[PDB]
């Protein structure tokens, strides 16, 4: 659906309202990524940069498939967050409450959304048609299936992927969608695809990798933040070698692995130049990564 200056302004107002709700001192938000208090103003700023780059050619901007999807989603997510406060009431202020957890997941979604927007409009101009996917075999798949498209409906992505990497069941497809659809808008962007295919490389065995590392691995934590990982490993502080892992939110495309050390500290690191399987095997051997989510059985990869 076409976007004009007006729908942007309406989105900006909804964003400001979320920011006012999230400023309540009772929430006590920590200034640490993802931090909704900086994410929303930052998304507004980048939207201003985009608008600026399209002055006198708003017609072009308004018709861009990706931009229309993005704005529709921004409106949906901001309304969702407002509805969340309205329905949760005081429950938003109990850390550990389900509605507060819902807000944290939203905060991560806004983080992924801003990273996506910046990836597709670097410097404020659309460059989705030339987005560079990092793994060569994944870039080939995307080109073969979708040409230079920036975004595709989930149904169309699933069908295309299945032809090269078989999906075994509907519930597997829904778990896959949950993993790759970072912006939670039922479309898959070339940026989301690049993220997933970096995280679950190598391409030759993509869905076997994801099934092993995420679908059935007790250590994988979907839509979890740095602070949540520190809180979750706290219950295992006297159990060195307890560990979990998740997408890094500031270095999208990379894994953050948290673990309990011998001296009872919780560290988090992002492996350098090594796919997850190898990071897990190496850390298993060294005794860092032994008990996924503090459990006694660790998958043998």
């Amino acid at each position: 659906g076409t976007v004009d200056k007006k729908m942007v302004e309406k989105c900006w107002k909804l964003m400001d309202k979320v920011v006012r709700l999230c400023q309540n001192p009772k929430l006590a938000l920590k200034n640490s990524p993802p931090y909704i208090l900086d994410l929303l103003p930052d998304t507004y700023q980048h939207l201003r940069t985009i608008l600026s780059r399209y002055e006198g050619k708003m017609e072009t901007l308004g018709e861009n498939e990706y931009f229309r999807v993005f704005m529709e989603n921004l409106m949906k997510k901001t309304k969702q967050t407002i509805s969340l406060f309205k329905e949760g009431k005081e429950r938003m202020y109990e850390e550990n409450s389900q509605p507060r957890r819902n807000l944290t997941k939203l905060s991560l979604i806004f983080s992924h959304m801003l990273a996506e927007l910046k990836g597709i409009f670097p410097s404020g101009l659309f460059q989705g048609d030339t987005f560079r996917i990092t793994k060569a075999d994944a870039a080939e798949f995307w080109r073969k299936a979708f040409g230079e498209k920036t975004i595709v409906p989930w149904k169309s992505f699933r069908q295309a992927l299945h032809e090269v990497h078989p999906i075994s069941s509907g519930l597997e497809a829904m778990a896959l969608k949950s993993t790759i659809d970072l912006t939670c808008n039922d479309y898959i962007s070339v940026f989301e695809f690049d993220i997933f295919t970096r995280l679950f490389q190598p391409w030759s065995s993509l869905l076997r990798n994801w099934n092993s590392l995420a679908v059935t691995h007790p250590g994988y934590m979907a839509f979890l933040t740095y602070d949540e990982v520190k809180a979750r490993l706290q219950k295992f502080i006297h159990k060195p070698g307890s560990y979990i892992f998740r997408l890094s939110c500031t270095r999208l495309g990379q894994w953050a692995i948290g673990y309990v050390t011998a001296d009872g500290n919780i560290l988090q690191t992002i492996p350098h130049n090594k796919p997850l399987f190898q990071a897990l095997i190496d850390g298993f051997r060294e005794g860092f990564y032994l008990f996924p989510d503090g459990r006694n059985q660790n998958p043998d990869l």
Binding site: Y226, S248, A256, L267, Q268, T269, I270
Partner: peptide
């Protein structure tokens, strides 16, 4: 934040 992230260490080695």
């Amino acid at each position: 934040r992230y260490d080695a």
